[PDB]
């Protein structure tokens, strides 16, 4: 199973590159594994922009 999800993740990198996302490899891995568990992804799209903003307020 781990061979399949790795290949699908490698394909998921290129389409998140041309769609101009804020993701790099680490937040792609955490958020794809989070989506695999299954919750509404429309709220995850807001929590990610909040996490980066709330770290940026410290800097």
């Amino acid at each position: 199973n781990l061979n399949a999800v790795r290949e699908t993740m490698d394909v998921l990198l290129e389409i998140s590159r041309i769609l101009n996302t804020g993701l790099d490899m680490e937040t792609l891995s955490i958020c794809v594994r989070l989506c695999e568990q299954g919750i509404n992804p429309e709220a995850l799209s807001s929590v990610i922009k909040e996490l980066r903003k709330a770290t940026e307020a410290l800097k």
Partner: protein, 158 residues
């Protein structure tokens, strides 16, 4: 597996130059921002509706790639549902632009100077960085060379 990758995410947002308590405070602000919003149509069609928005503003082959890959990715949808909303949070010649000399293609095209004029912009986009550098090295050093004495660089503030 999510609980180790959220730890790696908190490792990256920590600047690595102590620094074993700051990670946990970044974890505090991380959970404190995670539960804020939680307090208060197919997958691939969302890609199709934006591939149309791609095609209107030029750049045909990018939409041609975007639609074929999600076709074989549906032959995981929650990831694309995550991606259609993160598509605006990103960053803020060779030998083929107007090559009409070599090739087994027919040379038969009329003039409009709006294929060549965005071939003058393909050069000017290199030049518009390489000209802003010439402006932004003298202003960046004249804003630091001139100040008040004693507050001119913070290393005298030690």
């Amino acid at each position: 597996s999510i609980t180790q990758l959220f730890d790696d995410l908190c490792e990256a947002l920590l600047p690595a130059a102590n620094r074993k308590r700051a990670k946990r405070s970044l974890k505090k602000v991380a959970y404190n921002a995670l539960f804020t919003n939680l307090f208060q149509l197919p997958a691939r069609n969302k890609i199709l509706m934006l591939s149309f928005d791609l095609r209107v503003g030029g750049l045909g082959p990018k939409a041609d790639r975007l639609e074929e890959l999600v076709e074989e990715l549906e032959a995981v949808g929650s990831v694309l549902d995550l991606l259609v909303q993160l598509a605006g949070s990103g960053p803020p010649r060779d030998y083929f632009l107007n090559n009409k000399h070599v090739g087994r293609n027919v040379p038969y095209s009329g003039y409009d100077c709006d294929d060549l004029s965005v071939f003058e912009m393909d050069v000017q986009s290199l030049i518009s960085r390489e000209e802003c550098l010439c402006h932004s090295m003298i202003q960046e050093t004249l804003q630091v060379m001139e100040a008040a004495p004693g507050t001119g660089l913070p290393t005298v503030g030690l």
